[PDB]
Amino acid sequence: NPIHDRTSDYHKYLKVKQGDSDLFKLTVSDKRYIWYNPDPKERDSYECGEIVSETSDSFTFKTVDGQDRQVKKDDANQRNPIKFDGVEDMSELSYLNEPAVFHNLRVRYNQDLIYTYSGLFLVAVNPFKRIPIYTQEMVDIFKGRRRNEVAPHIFAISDVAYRSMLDDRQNQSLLITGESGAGKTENTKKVIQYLASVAGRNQANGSGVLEQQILQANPILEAFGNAKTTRNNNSSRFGKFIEIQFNSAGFISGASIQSYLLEKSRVVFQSETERNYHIFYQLLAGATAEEKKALHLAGPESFNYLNQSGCVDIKGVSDSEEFKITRQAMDIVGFSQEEQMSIFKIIAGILHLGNIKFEKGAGEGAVLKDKTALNAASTVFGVNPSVLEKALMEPRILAGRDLVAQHLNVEKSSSSRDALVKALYGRLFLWLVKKINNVLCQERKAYFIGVLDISGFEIFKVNSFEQLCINYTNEKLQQFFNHHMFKLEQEEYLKEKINWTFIDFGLDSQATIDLIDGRQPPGILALLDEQSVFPNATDNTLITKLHSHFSKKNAKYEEPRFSKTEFGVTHYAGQVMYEIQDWLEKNKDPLQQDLELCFKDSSDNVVTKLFNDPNIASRAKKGANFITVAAQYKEQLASLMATLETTNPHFVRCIIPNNKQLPAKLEDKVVLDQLRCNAVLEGIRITRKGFPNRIIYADFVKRYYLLAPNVPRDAEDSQKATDAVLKHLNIDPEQYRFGITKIFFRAGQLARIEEARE
């Protein structure tokens, strides 16, 4: 049942059902169409045309409503011949317009074919349905297969990365990106699944204990890193760089996980129709009778951190059941049964801190009249409720050389409480991953295949400091792609006898990067850092600086017309308006030293290494105190790229067909503007300067042969074996760059040579 049997699930679900015959009796076209739009202003809605007057000025195409508009060779989105509809590689489409590219994966999608190669890119549209293509029988089919040797699948790009590591003896990397809830996380899971198979270490068919530890380090991270949102009922609230390490033989020997940008806010505040992290709900419905009273728990709605968001129980699964796999995977990877209670006690404590309703007392300054929830909160932790009490409403400050206790109003006595909660969860999660690495990362890793999982550019309603970071990361990854293209493009420029004219891109992406992290002149991240060192500077002066540095003095910068708090940065994808607000606070992650030294000596074995160890409770020591959140981010990002540059990358781009989570719903607007949020199309357009028919070597030699007296069927060398149907037919040095060595083909004008009778 290989590529041979046409009645296998492989042919059924991953292939376009293959007719019979082949010759002049298969769908044939003898005319020409075009992609126009019925609505002039509305861009994302197109329709089939008809081209009736050629004249090299414009195209006077017919319509379907009977009328006859016009257009020239600047917008004419000439549609590809129908024999192309369905192609697995868009790298062959004679025309590369926006609608053309949308139509292909549109046809692919209606046939449940969600994977499609676009150049060196791997495109995958979220099916919102159960396609049975992830079986063990499926994995065995991709083993030892080549890209052009099989159909497009996450397994195809996985195997290829694995084979290259064994052959070229180089390191590999996968870059899976896209909007949240668009396919990723799941794709990256399939990558690990496949690799656990081909490079598995079990006698007969299974895991070798080690493999499971890896396969099980996943349920845990989703329990703390996932939650239901408006995009997906699982949606990842963090980025991650997973490194799968091997030995020389090609056997999986260990792995290591890297974490980024955890959504600390979700803990304290979930949005409408959304819910908090899974771990909370799995605990409540999961913990047995005695465990509930042990930590003083009650209903999943009697907690201020889980009730205001108008939703609790999700539609499709339970929670107590998935709490089984959580504690199950927790003891497979290795976590003391007591260390697991410790983890839960914090998850439980967090709930009670959210239940501390601060009330007003004598004039300003709050009062916790009802010491009910705090006591319980302080119980599970192991801290002094008395000192915790006033360390949260009467912290000391170092104003001058005086160190004075200070009563706080409700707003600031509540903010400090939420800041305490975030810090805890953000460190616990930072502790989880840490324990997992020491159980899976290694000492003498031979080679590794890395899987970067993070979202690309994203324009929300209100962009804040966390959006600046990822958009800053994307600017580099997108620069990494365009740069990687040079190297290769130049290579196959060499073995063609005739070599192409040196061509450069200095990459206009460097400008935006300078605007963000530049040193001299200072960039956003720089000016922001100088503004944070002062125990004084506000959010007004913060933006006052930027506007005085970049307004009318920087191309990528823009000052809003009527807005008094924002600024716009022109990225690769477009302009994004950023709101200032609490950047000055979140850039330092302040935590009143009293709450720090309050927890720093508690009764527990887990909650203490969170406050006592600088590897988890602090940042790099240089000059004054430790560094800023933005400083650490620039550093880690830079480190990420250092590794990436050492590897041979593969690019996967996830897509969502609709904002409703429905199958068979391919929205033009939604899907179309998503092919530009990413550029998977422009990736090929750069090769269009040479050849846009990218495929293997020469096929006109080994495909056609019936054509009228011109080229024979079998000639001597695949280079000039067809030395007539593509030259003496109105051609000369001006098409495909084939001298005497190697090349790829050119199909731009390909339409006059074939389309009628043989």
Swiss-Prot record:
Positions of ATP binding: G178, E179, S180, G181, A182, G183, K184, T185
Compartments (UniProt record): Cytoplasm, Cell cortex
Ranges for domain Myosin motor: 85-758
Annotated function: Myosin is a protein that binds to actin and has ATPase activity that is activated by actin.
Subunit-level organization: Myosin-2 heavy chain is two-headed. It self-assembles into filaments. Hexamer of 2 heavy chain subunits (MHC), 2 alkali light chain subunits (MLC) and 2 regulatory light chain subunits (MLC-2). Associates with elmoA.
Additional record remark: Dictyostelium myosin-2 has no K(2)EDTA ATPase activity, perhaps correlated with the absence of a Cys at the SH-1 position (688).
Domain notes: Limited proteolysis of myosin heavy chain produces 1 light meromyosin (LMM) and 1 heavy meromyosin (HMM). HMM can be further cleaved into 2 globular subfragments (S1) and 1 rod-shaped subfragment (S2).
Entry protein name: Myosin-2 heavy chain
Protein's organism: Dictyostelium discoideum (Social amoeba)
Gene: mhcA
Parent-protein start and end of this portion: 2 to 759 of 2116
